[PDB]
Amino acid sequence: KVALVTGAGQGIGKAIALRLVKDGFAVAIADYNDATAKAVASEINQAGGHAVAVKVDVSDRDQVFAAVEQARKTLGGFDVIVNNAGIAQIKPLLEVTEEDLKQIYSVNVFSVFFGIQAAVEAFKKEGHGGKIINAASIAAIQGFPILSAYSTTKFAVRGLTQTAARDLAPLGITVNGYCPGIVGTGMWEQIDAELSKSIALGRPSVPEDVAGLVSFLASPDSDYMTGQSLLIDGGMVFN
Amino acid sequence: KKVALVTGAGQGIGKAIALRLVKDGFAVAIADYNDATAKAVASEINQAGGHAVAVKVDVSDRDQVFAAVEQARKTLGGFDVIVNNAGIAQIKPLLEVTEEDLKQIYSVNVFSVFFGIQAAVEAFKKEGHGGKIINAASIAAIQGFPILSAYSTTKFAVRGLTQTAARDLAPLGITVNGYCPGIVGTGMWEQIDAELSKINGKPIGENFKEYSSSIALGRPSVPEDVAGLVSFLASPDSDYMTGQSLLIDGGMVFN
Amino acid sequence: KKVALVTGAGQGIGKAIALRLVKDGFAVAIADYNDATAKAVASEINQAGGHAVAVKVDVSDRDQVFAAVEQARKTLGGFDVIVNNAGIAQIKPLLEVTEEDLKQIYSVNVFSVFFGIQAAVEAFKKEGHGGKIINAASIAAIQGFPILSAYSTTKFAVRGLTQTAARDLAPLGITVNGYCPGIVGTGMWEQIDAELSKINGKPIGENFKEYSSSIALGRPSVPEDVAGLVSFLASPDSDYMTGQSLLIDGGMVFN
Amino acid sequence: KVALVTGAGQGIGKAIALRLVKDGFAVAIADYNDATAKAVASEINQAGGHAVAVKVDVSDRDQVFAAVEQARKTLGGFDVIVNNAGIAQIKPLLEVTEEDLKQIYSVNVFSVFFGIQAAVEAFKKEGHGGKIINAASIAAIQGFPILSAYSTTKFAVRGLTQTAARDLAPLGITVNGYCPGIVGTGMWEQIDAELSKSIALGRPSVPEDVAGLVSFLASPDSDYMTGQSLLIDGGMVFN
Ligand SMILES: NC(=O)c1ccc[n+]([C@@H]2O[C@H](COP(=O)([O-])OP(=O)(O)OC[C@H]3O[C@@H](n4cnc5c(N)ncnc54)[C@H](O)[C@@H]3O)[C@@H](O)[C@H]2O)c1
Ligand SMILES: NC(=O)c1ccc[n+]([C@@H]2O[C@H](COP(=O)([O-])OP(=O)(O)OC[C@H]3O[C@@H](n4cnc5c(N)ncnc54)[C@H](O)[C@@H]3O)[C@@H](O)[C@H]2O)c1
Ligand SMILES: NC(=O)c1ccc[n+]([C@@H]2O[C@H](COP(=O)([O-])OP(=O)(O)OC[C@H]3O[C@@H](n4cnc5c(N)ncnc54)[C@H](O)[C@@H]3O)[C@@H](O)[C@H]2O)c1
Ligand SMILES: NC(=O)c1ccc[n+]([C@@H]2O[C@H](COP(=O)([O-])OP(=O)(O)OC[C@H]3O[C@@H](n4cnc5c(N)ncnc54)[C@H](O)[C@@H]3O)[C@@H](O)[C@H]2O)c1
16 A cells, blocks of 8 residues: 655654554655655665655646656555645735745645645556545634634635545545644744744644544545544644 | 725626615725726616726736725725625536636635735725725535535635634724625526536536525525625624624525 | 514623614514513613513423413514523533533523424414524534533534524525624623632633633623624525524634 | 443444454443343453443433443443444424423433543543543534434534533543444434435445544544544535
C-alpha cells in the first residue's frame, strides 16, 4: 500500500508520513523543500521503511500530477493521498491584497483540487478505490481573527471535502479532512511572530496528535466514512 | 435616508433585494457589470419615487469596487449597508475543473467579497459610524453540491469570510452576515439547469425539479423570498446579530 | 388581526416578544405559570391600545397547553403564531446532576415544546390555514455550556425538535424556526450568575461578565435584541424559512 | 484495559464489544437482555478473550452505577465506557404522548448522564483518566421525519457529549460520540415495520462499520480529540 503526503518535509506532514510508514505504507514525501523531503525520505529508508522524496509546488497542477505518477511508479501503487501542504498569511483583513488572495488560494485550495484529480487518475490506473485526506483547520469551522485569508481558504477546503466526497463515492473513493487546533510547528512559529507585531484538555497540540487521526483516516476502519472534517483540537470547537 | 449598495442588482436576487430596500426607505446604488440593466433598474426606481443611482462595476476588480462604493457615498449622500450579491455559477464535473475555471470563479465570487468588505469599512469610517455588510452565500455553502464543486467551494469561502470579518470588525460597530438562498428560479438556475441537461441528458427543466425535490415547503424559491431576509439583515432588528449565514431555502438543510 | 400566543410572557424575553408582536399588529395571548405577571402584562397591553388576554398555564402540562391555545383561539378570534418561550435554567456541576433534576428540566424545557407544537397544529387546522411555530433555543443549543449541562442538553433537544417538526409539518404550510439568544440580562441570568457565584466563589456579577467576554459586539444582550428577531420570524418575510435556529448573540458562536 | 458497552447483547453494541476484544480490551457486556448478554460474553470467553455479562436497565441510575462497579471489580480496571443502549420510537409527531417522552428520554438521554457519572467515579477510583463514548445518530445532526422523539433524544446526546467534554477535560477524561447512518439491525427491523403502517457510498451500513470508528475512539490515537460527534454514515450528512 502506498501513500503520498504533501508538505511532508516538516511539521504535521512529516509526522503523518512517519505514522503511515509505521502503519505499513510506502510513502512519497512530497514538498517544495526538496532538502527536508529528501532528509525525511532517507530517514525512513534507513530505518527499513520504503520512501521516496518528490519535489512539487502543490499550486502547480502539472507538478502535482507528476508527483503522484512518480510516487505510483517508484513505490508500486497508489492508495492514499494526504493534501497537507499549506501556508498561513497573518495580515489584517483590511490589508489583504489581491496578490495575497491569488497566492494563498492557489497554495491552500487549488492544490487540493489538483491533488484530488491526480489521485483519482492514479486510483483508476491501479484499478481500485482509494482515500483522499485533506488538511483543513479549526479555522475551517469557526473563522479566526487576523487570519482572515487563511480561514477562508480552509473553509473552502472543508467545502471541497464535502462536494468531492459526494461526487467520488460511487467510485469507492472517499474524501475526509482533519482539523488541527493550535500545533507547535513552523507555521505557528511564524504566526507567533506576526501576531506580536481555550483548549479544554489544557495543552497545546503536537504533530503526532494529528498523525493519529490521519492513521485512522488512512485505515480500513474509516472505509464507510466520507465527507467529514474531523476536529482534533483538544476541545476548542465542538462539531 | 440611509444608503445601501447592492452588487449584481441588474437582475435576479440582487434586483429584488434592491427594490425591497427601496421600499424599506433606503437610497440604493445599483451596482452591476451589466451597465444596461443597472441603468434600467435605477431608472425604474427613480421613476417610481425612489432614489437610486446606477454604478458599473466588475466586483472582481478591487479598484472598481472602491470606486463604486465611493461613487455611491458621494451621489447618495451616505453609506450604511453593502450587499455583496454579485456572483457566477460554474457547472462542471469535479475531475474536469481547470485552473482557469478556479481562478475565474474565486475572483468573482470570493475576492469580490473581500474587496466589498474593505471598501465598505473605509466608507463607514469616512461617514463616522458603523454599518452592515451582507454577503450572498448559498445552500451550497452549507452542504457541498454535486457537479458544482467549484461554486460550492467559493460559497463555503464566503461563509468563512462572513464569520472572520464579523469577529474582526465588531469593535467598529460593523456587523457581517450572510444569506443562503436555496433553489431560486433566476437566470442562474436557467444556466445551471441547461448545463446539467447537457451533462446528464435530462430534458430542460428536469434537473431544476430534481434539485428541488428536497424542499420541505414543496416549491422552488423566488427572488422575493431572499429579499425579505435581506430586509431583516439591513434593518435595526438585526443589529445584535453578526457572523451568521442564514438559510431561507424552504427547508432543504437545517442550521 | 392575526393572533399570537407567547409562553413565559410574564417577564424577560417573553414579555419583550409579546410587546413587539403587539407593535407589529398581533393580538397576543400572554401565557405564563405566573398568573399575576401574565395578568399585569396583558393589562399593560390593553391599556395602551393593544389586544391581549392573560392565560395561566404550566407548559410542562400537555392538557394545560392545549387549553391555553384553545382559550387564545376563542378569545382573540384566531390563531396564527405560537412562541414556545417558557423555560427554566439549572446550574449544577455535571457529576452532581440528579434524575429528579433531569425529569424536571426536560418536562419544562422540552416536553413543553412538543405540546406547544401539537396544540398549535390542531389550532391551525381548526382555523383552516397554516401557521408559524417559533421556539426558544439558546446559544447553549449550539455549543454546550460548562456547569449548565442539563440546560444545554434540553436546548439541543429543542434545536433538534425545530428541525424535525419543520420537516414533518411543512406539507401543512406550517413552519418551525428557533431563536438562540446569547447572554441576556434577565431574571434567568440573575439566577445563573448567583448560582455560579455560590459554586466558584466569584462576586455577584463577575460570572455574568466572564461568560460575556466572548461577545464580539462587546456588550451583553437585552430582551429587545431577541424580540427583533422574533418579529422577523413572525412576519411574512420569514415564510420561506423553516427548520432554522437563528443566533442573535452579538457574535459568540457562528452558524 | 477494560471497557463496558451497553446494549451489547446484539447489533451495533455487540459489534463494538467484539472489536474492542480484538483490540485487547476485557469487556463488560451490559444489557437489559441478560440472555443475549451472557451469550455474547460466553462467546468472547470461549475464544480466549475476557468478558463478563452484566444485566442493567440503563434508565436506572443505581443499576448503571452497579454495572460499572461490577465490571471494574470483575475485570480488574475501568478505562472506557460506551453508552450505546437506546430505543427508537416510530410514532407520528402529533401522536407523541407525555408517557412516550418520559420513556424515550429516560432510556436514550438520562442513561448517558448516568453512564458518564458512573464512569467518572470508576476512573477516579482507578486513579487515571478515561474515554466516554456515546451513541448518537445521523438524526442527531439533521432531524429525521416520523422519528421526532428519537431525533430529539439524539440531539440531546450530541449536546451532552459537548458539554461533558468541556467539563471533564481537565481530569484527562474525554467524551466523544458516534453517529451511525442506516444500519441493518434489530432497531431498523422495527423501524421498517412501523414506517410501513441518499447514501453516497451506495450501500446500507453494517454494525462493523460503526465498530471500526469506536475502535479509534477507544484507542490512544483519539487522546487529543474531545467533544466531537463523528458521522460514519456512508455520506448522507456532511459535518
Ligand atoms: N500548525 C497548526 O497549528 C495548524 C492548525 C490547523 C491546520 N494546520 C494545517 O496543517 C497543515 C500542515 O501545517 P504545518 O503546521 O505542519 O505547516 P508547516 O509550515 O510546519 O509545514 C508546511 C510544509 O508544507 C510545505 N509547503 C508549503 N508550501 C508549499 C507548496 N506550495 N508546495 C509544496 N509544499 C509546500 C513546506 O515546505 C513545509 O514543509 C497546513 O495545511 C496547515 O494549514 C496547521
Ligand atoms: N438559486 C439561485 O439562484 C441561488 C442560490 C443560492 C445562492 N445564490 C447566489 O445569489 C446571488 C445572486 O444570484 P442570482 O440567481 O440573482 O444570479 P443572476 O445570474 O440572476 O444575477 C447575477 C447578477 O450579477 C451580475 N454580475 C455577475 N458577475 C459580475 C461581476 N464580476 N461584477 C459585477 N456584477 C456581476 C450579473 O450581471 C447579474 O446581474 C449569487 O451570488 C448567487 O451565487 C443564488
Ligand atoms: N440569557 C438568557 O436569558 C437566555 C439565553 C438563551 C436562551 N434563553 C431562553 O429564553 C427563554 C426566556 O428566558 P428569560 O431569560 O426571559 O427567562 P425568565 O426566567 O426571565 O422568564 C421565564 C418566564 O417563563 C415562565 N415560566 C417558567 N416555567 C414555566 C412553566 N412551566 N409554565 C409556564 N411558564 C413558565 C416564568 O414564570 C417567567 O415569566 C427561555 O427559554 C430561556 O431558556 C434565555
Ligand atoms: N440501527 C441504526 O441504524 C442506528 C442508527 C443511528 C444510531 N443508532 C444508535 O446505535 C445504538 C445501537 O443501536 P442498534 O441498532 O444496535 O439497536 P438494537 O435495537 O439492535 O440493540 C439495542 C440493544 O440495547 C439493549 N437495550 C435497549 N434498551 C435498554 C435499556 N433500557 N437498558 C439496557 N439495555 C437496553 C437491547 O436489549 C439491545 O440489545 C442505539 O443507541 C441507536 O440509537 C442506530
